[PDB]
Symmetry: C4
């Protein structure tokens, strides 16, 4: 179920924060692992002051993730995927909970590089853990990081992803809410 998945992801992230001195987590992609990482990020922000930013492919994906986060927090979802509504929801989520949800076209390497570069300008590269939310995101993220010369960051992204993938396969976040 969802709690077991969030707990397992939280434990993995705690191990990485201690291992790498992480101050900021950037999640690239959508789906169940993106939600689980965002929810673990809510706990990590409250308990450790570590901020999390999720980069999703389009405004529709941002609305879907913000709506699931809203439900988890007991808060209203944004009324629509209007950019102004999404930006306002994002600013509120950041101020109150240390989480962001931003739009970046992951099919476009230049757009993903630009979104990462914005986050690196805000949060730096040394203390930032970048994680893909799935296989497709890993395949998009690795070459971009490698082009930027961030080989260690790419290596950690792949290794931590493998552990998260295995943990979520066992935890089954959504098992109770579909056939």
């Amino acid at each position: 179920g969802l709690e077991a998945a969030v707990d397992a992801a939280y434990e993995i992230l705690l191990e990485e924060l201690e291992k790498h001195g992480v101050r900021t987590i950037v999640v690239v992609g959508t789906g169940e692992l993106a939600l689980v990482l965002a929810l673990a990020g809510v706990r990590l922000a409250r308990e450790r002051g570590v901020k999390t930013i999720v980069l999703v492919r389009d405004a529709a994906a941002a609305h879907r993730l913000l709506a699931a986060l809203a439900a988890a927090l007991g808060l209203p979802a944004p009324a629509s995927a209007d950019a102004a509504a999404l930006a306002a929801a994002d600013a509120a989520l950041w101020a109150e909970h240390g989480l962001r949800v931003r739009v970046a076209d992951l099919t476009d390497p230049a757009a993903l590089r630009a979104a990462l570069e914005a986050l690196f300008a805000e949060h730096g590269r040394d203390d930032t853990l970048v994680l893909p939310a799935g296989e497709a995101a890993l395949a998009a993220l690795e070459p971009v990081l490698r082009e930027l010369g961030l080989e260690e960051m790419a290596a950690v992204a792949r290794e931590v992803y493998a552990r998260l993938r295995a943990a979520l396969a066992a935890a089954r976040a959504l098992e109770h809410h579909h056939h």
Copy 2:
């Protein structure tokens, strides 16, 4: 009206908690009795520490029940029947109010058995009261319980259902909100 129906169901459940040493209530099905049982379960969780889980047939039914529970609690409904939104809403409802809403295909005996077996793994069989929300759910639930050897549980499910059915016929939960 709704308050009279919740009160009547609450009184019946209190009698069963004392009679059987009940720690967990599992409601199988949808409709007015499912809502009334869930609402009585909110009171029982607050007052007695007894948790309630409702098993509904599909994601659409989970959204409809979560939305009615939300309205009763003064909380936002989940934005959609997206599995991630439903799972997040369920985790929040459990943590704050001691209630869950899960999806289990009741037309499929193996799926209902699997969902009950998950709950029995979490909560045990001895202290768990299983109740159908209607005739169709009773007809689905009885053979599954009997196959599991849970004859007493099936007997209580049918007997308590009969009393709840009669009480709700008199109380008329929805009389003021349809023609």
Copy 3:
């Protein structure tokens, strides 16, 4: 604007509470006067312990009125016009704010009589002020009240309605929110 309309209706209702010893207000109908009366009823419940029940024609009308009340109170609207969602929202509104929104087919005299008779069973006839929300509701309500022998109640309904109609014509509740 809306505040001026609520204030004017509130002042009129205060005068009637003192004049008739009113404990319960029943509003029959939909539209701007129904909303203004419901909002004044929120204030009267908080300040005076007087409860208000609005009888609207169908579930769609109940959702629209509950949604406007929700917006005025800073609360989530019910997710849909599902009867269970409307009944749950109504129970929450009553418990927290002393207001109800019920469905009664005003085109059907027997249905309106039945809905009034339910309220009279709950709240009595002597201390109950019944008000139409518009001309059509007044035309439906007067014969029903007269058949019940409630001639004084019908007379007050018409007289107080006339004063509310004039006050709302001057106050223009919705002037700032349509062309």
Copy 4:
């Protein structure tokens, strides 16, 4: 991003409050600058007691702006663009946060004049800063103000707009929430 845009607009408005003794801000138009000005107005109301009213072209635009404001404040959006729902949301926003969102057809000079004249009746002309949200709104607002003899107000509207336009071009309120 949005926070940088709100901060930049806030700083400009603070300078104008000191420069002109402003008690009320009226924003004419829709779009990103309308949202940013409304959000800066939330801060100015809390910190300085300065109220802000946004005049938008139609009910659909009022819903979109109220929904984005709701998301920024962690509050439910109005269920629909129903005039009663919009008026109720507006009254709540004014009472709690010192902001209004009203409908005025800016394509119709008489309608814009009427909406401004209502605000001038409520708030006066001397202490009221009127700002367009974009080029089209400036082109609609200038002749109306000039016809009213409010030449200085029109001059300030154009000058402050130019500074806000430049600031928002640099701040990029919506950059993280569209492609």
